[PDB]
Amino acid sequence: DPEVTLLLQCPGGGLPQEQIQAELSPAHDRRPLPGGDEAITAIWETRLKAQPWLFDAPKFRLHSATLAPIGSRGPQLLLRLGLTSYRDFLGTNWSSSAAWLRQQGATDWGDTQAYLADPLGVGAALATADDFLVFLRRSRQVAEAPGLVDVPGGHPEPQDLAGQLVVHELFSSVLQEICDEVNLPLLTLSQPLLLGIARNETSAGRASAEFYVQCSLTSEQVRKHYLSGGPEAHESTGIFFVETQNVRRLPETEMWAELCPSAKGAIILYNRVQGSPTGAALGSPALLPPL
């Protein structure tokens, strides 16, 4: 899977909100482009003159994420964040010249991402009460990953003393994205656990935070909620479920070639952090079959 790289694997089966610090600083922003940000403005003008209903939105930028020494007391993760936008993303990560920007960032700053917007995404491994994970089918008509399989997710929106409010928005946003797209009541969802961070090398290294969320509804009940919205209540064109038993070998299935990179990141981290038991009971051969 060259199109996904793990930046962070969380310890302890995943981190709760109270164990994470954020540092939001203009030091963590994208660097101005070599020949100026006029190149971003030109791409945006061309786009608006074709699709004048499009508009810009602020986003969090991922600079880096440092884990504490394992087994320590106190905060376990520091997220270094800056600010970016949908406009800056279209002019950098989704530019035809994105690989040239990565090479120039290595040369100029010793940082392949220095000239990239790198907006932070969120996604969820969402488990049902009857032990399935939730998958969504993408429209064949959209620009990104058309017709591919995804997991629920979206965007934390900017709109430890500003730090704790930013961590709150990250955790809140993955629940809101589940409620908006799957049409589930908020009170059927657990507080999220952060599993890790994955990068999409097909989008020039754009990173997503991947979370575990448990729902108190069965797969049949989740399906009913999703469908009862009607086609206008969701961006996806379908919902489906895979037993958690079978997610263990998903990379060996024909489904793996249909998964978009950020969804592959969610499933790899689910397998490593929530699966992959370490104890004698769950590690015994009848509960963890060899191969």
Ligand SMILES: Cc1ccc(OCC(=O)N2CCOCC2)c(C)c1
């Ligand atoms: C991969 C990726 C996909 C969408 C996206 O942001 C979308 C957005 O902010 N929009 C503004 C309002 O109009 C709709 C689009 C970003 C930052 C990354």
